[PDB]
């Protein structure tokens, strides 16, 4: 992945409730291929399901989303995966909830 991107500044603190990697899409309710927004921690489906996270990006501008399938982080602006020290806490919390 990219080792940095200029949107990591928009990654917000993890809610104290933690993450729920089985949370369904906030729009369509699908259990499949959901992502969590690393700005506001809403959960929406991937582009191969109904594209609600892509829609969320379009109407919020929020840059970085984490996959509940493989804990990769995508930046919609950079059109790339990004991994940095600043993402370890949220990935670690997701990994603990998933496994
Ligand atoms: C399996 N990983 C992905 O699909 C990564 N990804 C993603 C991930 C986030 C998503 O599916 O909304 N979004 C894109 C949006 C427009 C264009 C490309 C992409 C993109 O390649
Ligand atoms: Zn959806
Ligand atoms: Zn968001
Ligand atoms: Zn970026």
Residue numbers in the entry: 1109 to 1207
Manuscript text:
HDAC6 is a structurally distinct microtubule-associated cytosolic deacetylase, harboring two tandem catalytic deacetylase domains2,3 and a zinc-finger ubiquitin-binding domain (UBD).4−6 The catalytic domains interact with dynein to transport aggregated proteins via microtubules to the aggresome for degradation,7−9 whereas the UBD binds free C-terminal diglycine motifs of polyubiquitin or polyISG chains associated with protein aggregates or other cargo. We previously identified and characterized the first small molecule binders of HDAC6-UBD, which can displace the native C-terminal ubiquitin RLRGG peptide from a narrow and deep pocket within this domain. These compounds have a carboxylate that mimics the C-terminus of the ubiquitin substrate and an extended aromatic structure that forms π-stacking interactions with W1182 and R1155.
The co-crystal structure also reveals that the N-Methyl group of 1 could be extended into the adjacent pocket to make additional interactions with the residues lining this site. To test this hypothesis, we first explored simple N-alkyl groups such as cyclopropylmethyl and benzyl groups, which could potentially extend into the side pocket, but they led to a significant loss of activity (data not shown). The carbonyl and NH groups of the amide of 9 make additional hydrogen bonds with R1155 and Y1189, respectively, compared to 1, while maintaining the π-stacking of the quinazolinone core with R1155 and W1182 and hydrogen bond of the carboxylate with G1154 and Y1184. The co-crystal structure with 9 indicated that other larger amide groups could be extended into the side pocket to further improve activity.
